[PDB]
Design a protein around this ligand. Structure first.
Ligand SMILES: O=C(O)Cc1c[nH]c2ccccc12
Length: 121
């Protein structure tokens, strides 16, 4: 679920999902179009594609379980949708962590009209 993803993001990065990743660039927090602005935005692009891979799942609301084995996120077994959603979220959270070094506040609340053109998953 969105709230669990948000908790995972905070755990990984020390930033609050809202507002740090809820309106960032072209793909974080609402997705759509455009060339992703930076590596963090590319995490969101891929995450959006990942959810797009699951047309008959409900990633915003369906809850999954995960644990930590040392630092590492381990998605625990639920329904197939839950497992797949968890893997999407885990990847995005890791990606955000890997790209924290280039995160830029100037991309928070990024205006939609600067995001143009379809980029295929
Ligand atoms: O529902 C959405 O697509 C947007 C959304 C609402 N609150 C959020 C918190 C963190 C990340 C995305 C969202």
């Amino acid at each position: 679920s969105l709230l669990e993803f948000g908790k995972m993001i905070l755990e990984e990065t020390g930033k609050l999902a809202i507002p740090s990743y809820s309106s960032y660039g072209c793909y974080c927090g609402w997705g759509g179009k455009g060339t992703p602005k930076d590596a963090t935005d590319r995490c969101c692009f891929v995450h959006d594609c990942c959810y797009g891979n699951l047309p008959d799942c409900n990633p915003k609301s369906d809850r999954y379980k995960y644990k930590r084995v040392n630092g590492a996120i381990v998605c625990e077994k639920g329904t197939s949708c839950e497992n797949r959603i968890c893997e999407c979220d885990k990847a995005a959270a890791i990606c955000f962590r890997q790209n924290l070094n280039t995160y830029s506040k100037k991309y928070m609340l990024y205006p939609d009209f600067l995001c143009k053109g379809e980029l295929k998953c």
